[PDB]
Design a protein around this ligand. Structure first.
Ligand code: K
Ligand code: K
Length: 699
């Protein structure tokens, strides 16, 4: 069901949750002064979500959330990324540099406090009401003198909600000794990762396992061998019961951003500028990279990760534009603004209509600048690798202006480091030239001569419109066009040559235009934010908050729904549950994405599923639910009707990515690893019994 709800809204939503099958008492899910399931949810390393699953501080999150830590501990001798990792005693769990988990110890509505303090600010158009520095000064004032000394590991933050109409203060408890305990092999953790990104059905065992360490009283402490596992106030019980179609499911976690209050004009702008440009420019870039990767196996090795990275937000933009085209997103926002405008007229209060018209007018005024910004960002800053070639600093240019040879040597050395990082082992000058010719052809079609970065005016003025000749000239003459050209430069460095370098002048020119567009566009954000404060206040006055969730803002939310598949297209149905049979159907030993771990294959051959399969002998892998998630919900716990852990959220289907603007009941799903499959992998693949024995596994 729709919405990413504040914990304060649990009372408002409880009747709807019970209608969908919730059996918990409200207090046990969230309460403000006691212990609740909210106390087992953590913010994992500043983006992801995770959950406490034992009375000794065991934490589950996704494999993709734990990846950087698994990779940091991996070597040729112990390649944990490929083999997995299973600590067979607590003393073998691996500490992690610069890691955190954050508990939300307390939440408080401070709206009246912040609105009182904002009365002091004289300028009615001040943006201090949304300023992180200003709200942190209010938090510090409220928490009082020596809050930190009186509360080990605790800190406070105030955040704005509903466009500045509501403020909450969070008291956060931060642990920095968080050790790696367990991870499946990447073949399981990343099964289908690029090909199946944003796809349901999905077959990925996307989990990893950490443990929170602390002092002997459970307070946060920096890494020490004297630290002991946290004895937490709440952990999740793990259900062996499984899921069935239509079962209630709920999620808690930290969704980052939504746009539920876009005007119709903002939907049109998101389609016609942001998404259309991203789709067109990435289709060009990807099409050239694919052609070069198919033709040369070494180019495939070098460019595979850059290609999949481009494809990530490409696929999301295609899904978002699909929803705008087919699912009525614009008309939904048109109806929302039309309803409030009709009500405002009945109330004798034109300020809501004025707010919608101010947003419309700002969107219309910025259209050509925003188009230019997205064209340069997708077409060149992201699109063309040599845009990020080195630019000598003034110090470096002075340094080899001079006759001090040793400062000169030091300037060349600094430049060499940036060149080596640019033209690294994954960089092909030939691929970059082909990509640049295709991307600049599009860019020069769309951006008129008078609005070009100055260096690009040389295509018309010096090369007679021949983009291939222009790009050929950059690489031919630049000291960064090849390793031999850089080495020749480093040997007899000419200050005149460097100031005239066509790659340096190209890079400088396109970053200059990008910067000047950014600076001219930024001011247009503020009138829309101020109008949204009014627009959202009207919507809330008119219809209340029960069916109007506040946009995500990196804070703790709950969502509820049911375990349920969907029909993507005519005569096609995707059910609610994938199985291990589906992993084996997808097995391809010559595609890294679809390798089946040999212990997992033997488990499947033997039907060695313990108590983790269904009664018919089918071993679950993933399920999907009608919960409302977005980026920031990776790793989130999935609870059944009784609050027991049934899975871990790890993705969303592409049909649902428009759901940041408008939830789609018949299309949007959260993609979740079944906890039964996590237990099977710990047991039969890791052989790590002590982790099963420390959990509370309930029927
Ligand atoms: K994804
Ligand atoms: K988002």
């Amino acid at each position: 069901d729709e919405g990413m709800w504040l914990m304060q809204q649990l009372g408002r939503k409880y009747a709807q949750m019970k209608e969908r099958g919730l059996k918990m008492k409200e207090y046990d899910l969230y309460n403000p002064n006691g212990t609740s399931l909210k106390d087992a949810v953590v913010l994992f390393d500043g983006g992801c979500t995770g959950e406490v699953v034992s009375d000794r501080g065991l934490v589950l999150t996704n494999h993709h959330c734990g990846y950087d830590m698994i990779q940091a501990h991996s070597t040729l001798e112990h390649n944990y990324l490929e083999n997995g990792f299973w600590a067979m005693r607590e003393a073998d769990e691996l500490p992690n540099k610069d890691i955190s988990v954050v508990f939300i110890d307390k939440i408080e509505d401070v709206t009246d406090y912040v609105k009182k303090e904002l009365k002091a600010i004289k300028d009615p158009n001040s943006m201090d009401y949304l300023s992180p520095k200003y709200l942190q000064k209010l938090a510090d004032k409220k928490a009082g003198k020596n809050f930190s000394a009186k509360n080990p590991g605790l800190s406070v933050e105030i955040k704005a909600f509903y466009g500045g109409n509501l403020y909450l203060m969070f008291t956060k408890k931060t642990y920095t000794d968080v050790r790696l305990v367990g991870a499946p092999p990447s073949s399981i953790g990343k099964f289908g990762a690029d090909t199946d990104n944003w796809i349901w059905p999905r077959h990925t065992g996307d989990f990893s396992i950490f443990r929170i360490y602390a002092d002997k009283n459970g307070n946060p402490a920096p890494y020490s061998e004297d630290n002991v596992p946290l004895k937490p106030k709440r952990f999740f019980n793990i259900s062996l019961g499984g899921v069935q179609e239509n079962d209630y499911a709920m999620i808690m976690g930290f969704p980052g951003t939504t746009h539920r209050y876009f005007t119709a004009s903002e939907v049109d702008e998101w389609k016609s500028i942001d998404n259309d440009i991203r789709i067109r420019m990435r289709d060009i870039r990807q099409g050239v990279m694919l052609r070069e990767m198919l033709a040369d196996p070494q180019i495939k090795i070098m460019y595979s990760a850059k290609y999949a990275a481009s494809q990530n937000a490409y696929k999301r933009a295609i899904g978002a534009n699909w929803a705008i085209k087919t699912r009525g997103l614009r008309q939904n926002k048109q109806a929302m603004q039309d309803r409030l405008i009709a009500w405002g007229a009945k109330q004798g209060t034109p300020r809501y209509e004025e707010a919608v018209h101010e947003i419309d007018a700002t969107v219309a005024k910025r259209a050509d600048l925003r188009r230019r910004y997205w064209m340069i960002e997708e077409g060149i800053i992201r699109g063309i690798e040599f845009a990020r070639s080195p630019i000598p600093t003034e110090d470096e240019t002075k340094a080899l202006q001079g006759n001090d040879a040793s400062a000169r040597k030091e300037a060349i050395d600094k430049i060499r480091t940036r060149y080596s990082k640019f033209a690294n082992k994954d960089y092909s000058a030939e691929v970059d030239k082909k990509v640049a010719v295709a991307m600049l052809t599009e860019y020069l079609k769309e951006i008129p001569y008078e609005n070009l970065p100055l260096h690009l005016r040389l295509v018309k003025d010096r090369f007679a419109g021949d983009v291939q000749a222009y790009v050929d000239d950059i690489f031919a003459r630049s000291v960064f066009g090849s390793e031999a050209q850089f080495d020749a430069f480093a040997a007899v460095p000419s200050v005149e040559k460097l100031a005239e370098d066509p790659m340096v002048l190209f890079a400088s020119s396109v970053f200059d235009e990008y910067r000047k567009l950014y600076n001219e566009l930024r001011p247009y954000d503020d009138p829309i934010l101020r109008a949204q404060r009014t627009y959202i206040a009207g919507l809330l006055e008119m219809d209340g908050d029960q069916d109007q969730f506040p946009d995500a803002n990196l804070t703790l939310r709950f969502t509820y729904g049911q375990v349920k598949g969907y029909s993507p297209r005519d005569n096609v149905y995707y059910g609610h549950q994938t199985t291990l049979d589906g992993v084996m159907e997808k097995e391809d030993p010559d595609n890294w994405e679809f390798v089946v771990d040999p212990k997992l294959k033997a488990v499947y051959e033997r039907k060695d599923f313990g108590r983790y399969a269904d009664r018919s002998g089918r071993m679950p892998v993933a399920f999907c639910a009608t919960t409302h998630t977005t980026g920031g919900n990776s790793g989130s716990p999935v609870m059944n009707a009784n609050g027991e852990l049934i899975g871990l959220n790890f993705d969303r289907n592409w049909e649902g990515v428009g759901g940041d603007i408008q939830y789609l009941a018949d299309y949007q799903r959260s993609i979740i690893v079944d906890i039964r499959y996590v237990l099977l992998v710990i047991d039969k693949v890791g052989g790590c019994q002590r982790l099963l024995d420390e959990m509370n596994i309930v029927p």
